[PDB]
Each structure stands twice: as C-alpha cells, then as structure tokens.
Design a protein around this nucleic acid. Structure first.
Length: 55
DNA sequence: CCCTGGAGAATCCCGGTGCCGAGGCCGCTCAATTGGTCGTAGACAGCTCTAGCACCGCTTAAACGCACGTACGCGCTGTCCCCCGCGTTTTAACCGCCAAGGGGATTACTCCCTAGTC
C-alpha cells in the first residue's frame, strides 16, 4: 500500500512543495522554491507556478 | 429532413330572461356658522456668533495600463426521475323527513278599579 496510491499525484506533489517550503529559513528562498523543486524532481517552473498553489 | 388538412376543442361574443339592490324619495336631526372675548403664539427686527469658501504647498495613497494567466459561466453532450392529465373512488356540505318542547303573542274568564242615586 504505497502512499502514492492513497494520495494522488496532485496531493503528493502538494506534500512535496510544502516540504520544500519548509526547507527554507528566510523570505528570500520562497521564490527559490520552484528552482529547488526543479533541481529535485526535474519539473519546469511553469507548472510549479501554475499548479502547486503554495501558501 | 419539417409542413399542414383535417379535426378536436377552447374563446369571443351578443341575445335573452330573471333578480335584488342603487338610487331616489320621505322624515327627522344635530352640528358648522356666527356674535363676542382675551390671551397665545408666531411674525418682525436685532444683536450676536460660528461654522464654512477659497486659498496657499505638500505626500505619498490610490488609480490606471500592461502583461500573464487561468479557471468559470455558459453552452454542448447525455440520461433519469418524477409530475401531470385523465380515470375511478370517497369525504363533504345541504336540504328534506319526523315528533316534541319554548315561547311569544293572543284572546277568554274574571275581578277588582271606577263611579251613580232613592
């Protein structure tokens, strides 16, 4: 029972971007979240800004 | 593909007779006019006083364009579910039937209130 099944792709990606937004310790790295997530999983910043829906 | 002759049926409408009440007519009738008073409250200044008209230079706070962007009102698809028109049944007021009081008037017996004369 993988959590990728109970939680859909959108939900696991939301958990991931919340994780990366917990990684930062300052204001300045909040726009660095798309860059960090693209470095992590290789997703373009377009869908990061379009579908992640951050805090 | 979509239009309609015929038919079923609802509408508009004026004769066409019966009814009850809108309006006129009659008999009171009571309240608005009107004489006055006398004194009350608002018009007429008048002094006052008090908030606003326009003016000056700033201050960035809102206002607006531009560009991205993105998701929602609306319009497309389909089904499904549920309410209507019609057919059958049952409460639901309304008007007749009957024998007995209640009573309101209505009149009959009578009995006291009234009033006359040898």
């Amino acid at each position: 029972h993988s959590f990728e099944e109970r939680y859909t792709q959108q939900e696991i990606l939301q958990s991931d971007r919340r994780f990366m937004e917990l990684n930062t310790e300052n204001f300045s790295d909040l726009p660095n979240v798309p860059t960090l997530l693209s470095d992590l999983t290789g997703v373009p910043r377009d869908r990061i800004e379009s579908t992640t829906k951050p805090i």
